[PDB]
Every structure is written in C-alpha cells, then in structure tokens.
Design a protein around this ligand. Structure first.
Ligand SMILES: Nc1nc2c(ncn2[C@@H]2O[C@H](COP(=O)(O)OP(=O)(O)O)[C@@H](O)[C@H]2O)c(=O)[nH]1
Length: 260
C-alpha cells in the first residue's frame, strides 16, 4: 500500500541494502522493450511496504535507457517516497543525483550508506547538519554491520507525498532562482504542481525529452526561450553549464558544513 523508490549511484550499496530489506520476497523482470533489469520486493518486516528498485545512475540525463527509466518512474508519481542510497565515502559526487531527486517532488529520505567504511578512513559526517542543509531526513546505514536499515526504511515509509506538506528545495544563485520562477509563471498548469520545478529546470537546460514530450503553446515556448537567452547573458555561460555549476556549488557548500 506504500511504494518506495530505491535509487542511487552505482557502487553505493543499493543491491546489498535492497537484499537485506526485501530478503526472499523479490520479483525480477525487466522494463518494457529494453534490457534494463527491473527488481521489486516487499519489506520483510512490513509487507504493506513495496520497494521499487531503480537502476543505478549518476544523474537524470536523457541520453540512456537507465536514466530515462528512472526519470519516467519518478515523474509518474507511482512512488510515495524516494529512499536515496548515498555512498558516504564519496559524498560530494553522490549528492549531484540527490539534488535532482529532491526536485522531482517525491519526498527524499537518505540512507547514508557504508558508514562503517567512513569510520575506517578518519572522516566524519555530521548527520543532523547534513539533514538540515539538504532539507531531508538522514539515517546512517551499513549493509555489512546491519545497522540503521530498519530505521531508514521506517523513516522512508512515513516521509511520503501524503505526510510531507511543505517541501524545501535546494536554493541556487538568486539570478538562476529568478529564471526558474519566470519559467514556472509561464508554464502555468501545463505541468503538475508537485514536479513543476523539475520541469522548469529541465526546460532551462534545454532537455530534449521534456521539450519533445510536453504539449506547450507557442507563446509559452517563445517566453521560455527569452528567459533562457537573457539568463545566459547575465551569467556569460550556456544554460546547461549554469545549472551544473550551481548544483556543484550548492553541494560544495553543504559538504563543508557537514564534513570533518
Ligand atoms: N564495507 C561495506 N561494504 C559494502 C556495504 N554495502 C555494500 N558494500 C560493498 O560495496 C560493493 C557494492 O555493493 P552493491 O550492493 O553491489 O552496490 P550497488 O552497485 O549500489 O548495487 C560490493 O563489493 C559490496 O561488497 C557496506 O555497508 N559496508
């Protein structure tokens, strides 16, 4: 009755964590007409929770079936919650996907995974600080030591589209935030309220799939074009690089607050 999308970078420990949560309740097939494996399963300790395992990705670009699948699932609102598996030892790179996942509008809970490995390296991540700055709940997890796994699944199960009333998105440079606002005003009700920021940001980036699979009017197209052009002049960069740099700056800022 509650659906949780499990997703993260490759080699973040998604499968290990998935197998510990779901155990001998797994169903393994594939996505329609494509060789990407599709795993699903019910939570051992609560059969009313279903985990939808998604493919491991580094971002939500449109140039591969793995990412196109992850994107299409999250935008459809089939999941009530995102359980984002983050490799704690490679935190800065991992959070690039997280910023995009938070923007989908489905609530994110973070499984800060492989925490035992971080203990063996001498680094320390302040979990409360990390949680306050990303604006999402965070639980430390180890698939090896089997710690914090029931805690993070429980938190995911109670942090859903039904329970979270007011979502806090990552704030970027105010000049980029103006553009996103202007893109939202023009889009109107052409996009769902929940995932609106995702679409606005992706149209700014000039993403092929969103542009090519959205029935906008011609005036809406021309308005967004000017928002993009004008913004590029303010920054003296192309639209794609503006967003990339602003994500990495926000991530850099966050890690410096939480890292040792
Ligand atoms: N030390 C430690 N290693 C882990 C943990 N979880 C996974 N691994 C290791 O990390 C690698 C990736 O695991 P896997 O679940 O396949 O990651 P995925 O690519 O995200 O599915 C494997 O070689 C595991 O042995 C953990 O909690 N602690």
């Amino acid at each position: 009755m509650t659906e949780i999308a499990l997703i993260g970078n490759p080699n973040s420990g998604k499968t290990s964590l998935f197998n510990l949560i779901t155990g001998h309740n797994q169903r393994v097939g594939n996505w329609p007409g494509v060789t990407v494996e599709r795993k699903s399963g019910l939570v051992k300790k609560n059969k009313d929770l279903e985990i939808q395992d998604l493919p491991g990705i580094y971002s939500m670009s449109p140039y591969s079936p793995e990412e196109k699948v992850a994107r299409d699932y999250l935008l459809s609102q089939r999941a009530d919650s995102i359980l984002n598996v983050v490799d704690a030892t490679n935190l800065e790179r991992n959070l690039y996907l997280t910023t995009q996942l938070i923007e989908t509008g489905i609530p994110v809970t973070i499984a800060l995974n492989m925490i035992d490995v971080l203990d063996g390296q001498g680094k320390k991540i302040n979990v409360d600080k990390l949680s306050y700055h990303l604006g999402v709940p965070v639980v430390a997890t180890s698939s090896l030591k089997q710690t914090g796994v029931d805690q993070v699944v429980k938190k995911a199960a109670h942090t859903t589209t039904s329970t979270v009333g007011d979502l806090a998105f990552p704030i970027y440079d105010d000049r980029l935030e103006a553009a996103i606002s202007q893109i939202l005003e023009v889009l109107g009700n052409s996009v769902p309220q929940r995932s609106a920021r995702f679409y606005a940001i992706k149209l700014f980036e000039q993403d092929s799939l969103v542009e090519a699979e959205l029935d906008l009017s011609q005036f809406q197209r021309k308005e967004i074009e000017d928002i993009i052009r004008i913004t590029e002049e303010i920054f003296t960069e192309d639209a794609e690089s503006i967003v990339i740099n602003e994500r990495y700056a926000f991530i850099e800022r966050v890690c410096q607050m939480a890292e040792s």
